[PDB]
């Protein structure tokens, strides 16, 4: 498991 | 707050194919002030793109290169929206 | 967007520890209007929190549970700001 986590504001 | 008021849906929250953009929509219009967070986790790196449209909707697309099962998380103000995390089967091309 | 006018910095853009909040600030005051995107990519999923402060700064904190190399990207109106993406080694406790 690898992951890409993005926060937008 | 707000997460319970957000909705997401579209083909990319249901099933996808390796190397093909998997697309869905988020509607946060009723949720008030906040930050949206999207994550994709599974057997390969996701490339995630986001379009903030002028029409009350936010578009998301991701691409992953390896087939397998992936989780897609959508959070509003640090809280999962209804039905998140989503489990999406990604098929071979 | 004036991504080239944005600056970020802090310990969370340099080194982190698994399971411990990694913190940095962004200053977009000189950039004008625009949206920010903060992405963390690596061996486990990041929890990201953001604080729009009254003092002209934006506080970011992330936590990741697994040790390893993470890439932290900061984009303003969809362009990388100066020095983004940042490679951040996250060590295993001890």
Curated annotation (Swiss-Prot), chain A:
Q: In which tissues is it expressed?
A: Isoform 1 and isoform 3 are expressed in heart, kidney, lung, pancreas, placenta and platelets. Isoform 2 is expressed in brain, heart, kidney, lung, pancreas, placenta, skeletal muscle and platelets.
Q: Where in the cell is it found?
A: Cell junction, Focal adhesion; Cytoplasm, Cytoskeleton, Stress fiber
In the UniProt record, the signal sequence range is none
The text the record gives for the protein's domains is: The N-terminal region is intrinsically disordered.
Q: What quaternary structure, including any partners, is listed in this protein's UniProt entry?
A: Interacts with NKX2-5. Isoform 1 and isoform 3 interact with FERMT2, FLNA, FLNB and FLNC. Isoform 2 interacts with FLNB.
Q: What does this protein do?
A: Serves as an anchoring site for cell-ECM adhesion proteins and filamin-containing actin filaments. Is implicated in cell shape modulation (spreading) and motility. May participate in the regulation of filamin-mediated cross-linking and stabilization of actin filaments. May also regulate the assembly of filamin-containing signaling complexes that control actin assembly. Promotes dissociation of FLNA from ITGB3 and ITGB7. Promotes activation of integrins and regulates integrin-mediated cell-cell adhesion.
Q: What is this protein called?
A: Filamin-binding LIM protein 1
Swiss-Prot record, chain B:
Q: What does this protein do?
A: Promotes orthogonal branching of actin filaments and links actin filaments to membrane glycoproteins. Anchors various transmembrane proteins to the actin cytoskeleton and serves as a scaffold for a wide range of cytoplasmic signaling proteins. Interaction with FLNB may allow neuroblast migration from the ventricular zone into the cortical plate. Tethers cell surface-localized furin, modulates its rate of internalization and directs its intracellular trafficking. Involved in ciliogenesis.
**UniProt family annotation:** Belongs to the filamin family.
Query: Which domain of life, per UniProt?
Result: Eukaryota
Q: How is it modified after translation?
A: Phosphorylation extent changes in response to cell activation. Polyubiquitination in the CH1 domain by a SCF-like complex containing ASB2 leads to proteasomal degradation. Prior dissociation from actin may be required to expose the target lysines. Ubiquitinated in endothelial cells by RNF213 downstream of the non-canonical Wnt signaling pathway, leading to its degradation by the proteasome.
Q: Which residues of the full protein are shown?
A: 2236 to 2328 of 2647
- Quaternary structure and interacting proteins, as annotated: Homodimer. Interacts with PDLIM2. Interacts with RFLNA and RFLNB. Interacts with FCGR1A, FLNB, FURIN, HSPB7, INPPL1, KCND2, MYOT, MYOZ1, ARHGAP24, PSEN1, PSEN2 and ECSCR. Also interacts with various other binding partners in addition to filamentous actin. Interacts (via N-terminus) with MIS18BP1 (via N-terminus). Interacts (via N-terminus) with TAF1B. Interacts with TMEM67 (via C-terminus) and MKS1. Interacts (via actin-binding domain) with MICALL2 (via CH domain). Interacts (via filamin repeat 5) with SYK; docks SYK to the plasma membrane.
> Mind telling me what this protein is named?
Filamin-A
Q: Where expressed (tissues)?
A: Ubiquitous.
Q: Write down the species.
A: Homo sapiens
The protein's location, in the record's own words, is: Cytoplasm, Cell cortex; Cytoplasm, Cytoskeleton; Perikaryon; Cell projection, Growth cone
Q: Where does the record place the modification Phosphoserine?
A: 49, 92
Q: Filamin repeat ranges?
A: 1-90
The gene for this chain is FLNA
From Swiss-Prot, chain C:
In the record, Phosphoserine modifications are located at 49, 92, 94
What is the annotated localization of this protein? Cytoplasm, Cell cortex; Cytoplasm, Cytoskeleton; Perikaryon; Cell projection, Growth cone
**What does the UniProt record tell us about how this protein is modified after translation?**
Phosphorylation extent changes in response to cell activation. Polyubiquitination in the CH1 domain by a SCF-like complex containing ASB2 leads to proteasomal degradation. Prior dissociation from actin may be required to expose the target lysines. Ubiquitinated in endothelial cells by RNF213 downstream of the non-canonical Wnt signaling pathway, leading to its degradation by the proteasome.
Q: Where are the Filamin repeats?
A: 1-90
Q: What does this protein do?
A: Promotes orthogonal branching of actin filaments and links actin filaments to membrane glycoproteins. Anchors various transmembrane proteins to the actin cytoskeleton and serves as a scaffold for a wide range of cytoplasmic signaling proteins. Interaction with FLNB may allow neuroblast migration from the ventricular zone into the cortical plate. Tethers cell surface-localized furin, modulates its rate of internalization and directs its intracellular trafficking. Involved in ciliogenesis.
Domain notes from UniProt:
Comprised of a NH2-terminal actin-binding domain, 24 immunoglobulin-like internally homologous repeats and two hinge regions. Repeat 24 and the second hinge domain are important for dimer formation. Filamin repeat 20 interacts with filamin repeat 21 masking the ligand binding site on filamin repeat 21, resulting in an autoinhibited conformation. The autoinhibition can be relieved by ligands like ITGB7 or FBLIM1. Filamin repeats 19 and 21 can simultaneously engage ligands.
Q: Which family does the record claim for this protein? A: Belongs to the filamin family.
| Record-given protein name | Filamin-A
């Amino acid at each position: 498991r690898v992951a890409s986590s993005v926060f937008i504001t | 707050g707000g997460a319970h008021k957000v909705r997401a849906g579209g083909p990319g929250l249901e099933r996808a194919e390796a190397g093909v953009p998997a697309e869905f929509s988020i509607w946060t219009r009723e949720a008030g002030a906040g930050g949206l967070a999207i994550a994709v986790e599974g057997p390969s790196k996701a490339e995630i793109s986001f379009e903030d449209r002028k029409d009350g909707s936010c578009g998301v697309a991701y691409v992953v290169q390896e087939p397998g099962d992936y989780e897609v998380s959508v959070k509003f103000n640090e809280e999962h929206i209804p039905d998140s995390p989503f489990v999406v089967p990604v098929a071979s091309p």
